[PDB]
Amino acid sequence: TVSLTEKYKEFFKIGAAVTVKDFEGIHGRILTKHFNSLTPENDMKFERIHPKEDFYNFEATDKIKDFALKHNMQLRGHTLVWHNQTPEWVFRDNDKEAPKELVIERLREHIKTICTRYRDVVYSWDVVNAAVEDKTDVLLRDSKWRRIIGDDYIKIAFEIAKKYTGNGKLFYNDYNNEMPYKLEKTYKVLKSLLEEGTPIDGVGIQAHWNIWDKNLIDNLKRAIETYASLGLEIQITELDISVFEFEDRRTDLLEPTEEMVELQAKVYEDVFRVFREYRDVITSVTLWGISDRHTWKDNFPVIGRKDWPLLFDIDGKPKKAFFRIIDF
C-alpha cells in the first residue's frame, strides 16, 4: 500500500504532471493514493491558456484546480514566461514587431489574470522557464522575450508575479542545471537576480535524466548544495529517468532490457537518497507523469517511439524502483 506522499509527508511534497484525463480510471487512483502535488503538463502554458489577446481558455486548468481542492492537493503554476509554447500575438503590434513596453504590458495582464485565478491553490510558480542559454557560453538564451524586453526581463517577470501570487513561492525553472557548465552559469544568473532585489524564492531542477549518466549523483549533490548557498528553496520539478542516452534515437525497443530496468532502479534509489539527504532545502519533488502509459518521452526527442521513464509501469503497477525509494 504505502502511498508515496504519506511516506514522504515529513520531507517534501510529492508531485505529478497531469492533464484532465488523468483524474479518471487507474491514473486517478494513483494520484489520490500517492500524490499531493499536481502540475498541469500543458494547460497553464501561455499558448494553451491565452491563445489570442482577447481569449483565455480556463476550462482545463479550472478542472485541475477543482480536482486538487477536492483531494487536498496543491498545484505548481507552470509556466508564465518561456520561449516555447507561447503564441506569436504577444510579440506583434499589427504588421510591426511589438516594442518593449507593449510586451511588458501584455505580460502584466497575462500574469495578473492567471495568477489571480489560481493563487489560492498554487504553492509554487515557474515564473521563468529555461532562460539560461544551454548551448553557447552567453548567459541568457536569446528568445523573443529576452530580445524585446531586454536584459532585465527575468527580474521584471518576477516583480510582476509577486504582486498577484500571495504566499505562493516564485521559482526559476530549468533543465540540465545540475550539469557543471550550466550549474556555474545558472548560479551566476541567480546570484545577480537576488542582489538586484528579485523576489525569487527558489530554483527548479527539471531533472530530465537518464540511466547512463555516471556523473549524475555527484552533479546533483553539487547543484543542490550550490543553489542552497544562495538561500534558495529547491524543487525537483519534472523528474523522469529515460532508458536512452539523449542522442540514442533507436526506435527498435518494445520493452526495457533487464540491465535498463535494474539500472533505473539504482538511479532512482541514488537520486531519492540524495533528495532525502537534502530534506531541509528540498520542498517538492514532482515526476513528469504518473505511469509509463503517458509520457512526453514517447515523442521527445524522437517522435513515435516508447520510453519507460517513471515510477509506475504501463499497467499502473509500482516498479521495483518505486519500492526502492520507499524503503527508508
Ligand X SMILES: O[C@@H]1[C@@H](O)[C@H](O[C@@H]2CO[C@@H](O[C@@H]3CO[C@@H](O)[C@H](O)[C@H]3O)[C@H](O)[C@H]2O)OC[C@H]1O
Catalytic residue positions? Answer: 238
Instruction: Write the binding mask 88 to 117 for ligand X: x where contact by CB under 6 A, - elsewhere.
Output: ------------------------------
Q: Which is nearer to ligand X, 36 or 206 (CB)?
A: 206
Q: Mention every residue, 6+ apart, whose C-beta is less than 8 A from residue 192.
A: none
Least distance in angstroms from the C-beta of 18 to ligand X: 11
Q: Could you say whether residue 206 binds ligand X (CB under 6 A)? A: yes
**Total of chain residues touching ligand X, rule CB under 6 A:** 8
Q: Which is nearer to ligand X, 30 or 205 (CB)?
A: 205
Q: Which is nearer to ligand X, 98 or 232 (CB)?
A: 232
Partner residues linked to 78 by β-bridges: 126
The one-letter code for the residue type at 50 is H
Q: Which is nearer to ligand X, 130 or 310 (CB)?
A: 130
Q: Could you say whether residue 175 binds ligand X (CB under 6 A)? A: yes
Q: Could you say whether residue 176 binds ligand X (CB under 6 A)? A: no
Q: Could you say whether residue 131 binds ligand X (CB under 6 A)? A: no
Q: Which is nearer to ligand X, 8 or 175 (CB)?
A: 175
Q: Which is nearer to ligand X, 104 or 130 (CB)?
A: 130
Distance CA 87, CA 269 (A): 40
Instruction: Kindly report the number of other CB atoms within 10 A of residue 32's CB atom.
Output: 17
C-beta nearest to ligand X: residue: 296
Q: Could you say whether residue 22 binds ligand X (CB under 6 A)? A: no
Q: Could you say whether residue 307 binds ligand X (CB under 6 A)? A: no
Considering only residues 30 through 89, tell me which ones interact with ligand X, judged by CB under 6 A.
41-42
Q: Could you say whether residue 235 binds ligand X (CB under 6 A)? A: no
Radius of gyration of the chain (CA): 19
Q: Could you say whether residue 130 binds ligand X (CB under 6 A)? A: yes
Least distance in angstroms from the C-beta of 77 to ligand X: 12
Positions in the binding site for ligand X (CB under 6 A):
41-42, 129-130, 175, 206, 238, 296
